[PDB]
Amino acid sequence: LPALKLALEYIVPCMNKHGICVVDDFLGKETGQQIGDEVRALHDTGKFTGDKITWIEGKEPGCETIGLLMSSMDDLIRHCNGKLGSYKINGRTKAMVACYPGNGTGYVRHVDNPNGDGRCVTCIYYLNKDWDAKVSGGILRIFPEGKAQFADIEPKFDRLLFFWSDRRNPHEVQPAYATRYAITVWYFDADERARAKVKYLTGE
Ligand SMILES: Oc1c(-n2ccnn2)cnn1-c1cc(N2CCOCC2)ncn1
Ligand SMILES: [Cl-]
Ligand SMILES: [Cl-]
Ligand SMILES: [Cl-]
Ligand SMILES: [Mn+2]
Predict the structure, then answer these.
(1) Relative to the CA of 27, which of 37, 49, 52, 128 has its CA 20 to 30 Å away?
(2) Among 191, 170, 173, residue whose Cα is nearest residue 114
(3) Domains of the chain: which residue ranges?
(4) C-alpha torsion 141→96→10→145, nearest 10
């Protein structure tokens, strides 16, 4: 589907019904591999003589295709104009470009935004080519609040994931046995983000 059709026919009704939406084959193989090359360049540096996080705006040298990813995410969110709950999405974070070690470590269950920090939608893009979660792990488990079911989401290559960032979606990540990368972006609700910012002295 084109971005308009995908947003209105799939992403919007999926998010309002479930709070979780998976889009597969988001950018295609060639672009996905290019993003992987850029991400590995950021994190796979050598040496002279937890996890790794970098925050990317999208116009840094060697990050142009990460920027294309962010523009593509922005395109989908824009076409959701005012249809994602009651939110008015007026901005987002930088891209969190993460490298997660394959050392048998998982991520404890948590809520991204538990206390009204302004973030209403979490977007995650998975860029590890030919990742087989059945063999290598790394599955995301989301527990939508009050539902009888929970969801396991495999970090499949070129997969885009949306979910509500607030207490509706506690989530945990199972351990993995190879290095993997994911890029996360959070979209802000205008009113909540404004309220969260009033406490600061001109300091964001
Ligand atoms: O890194 C992840 C994963 N994950 C792990 C492996 N695969 N996916 C799932 N949530 N999550 C995360 C990270 C985060 N940070 C990271 C440290 O800086 C501050 C903000 N804030 C909220 N959620
Ligand atoms: Cl939790
Ligand atoms: Cl966290
Ligand atoms: Cl902000
Ligand atoms: Mn999280």
Answers:
(1) 52
(2) 170
(3) 1-204
(4) 40
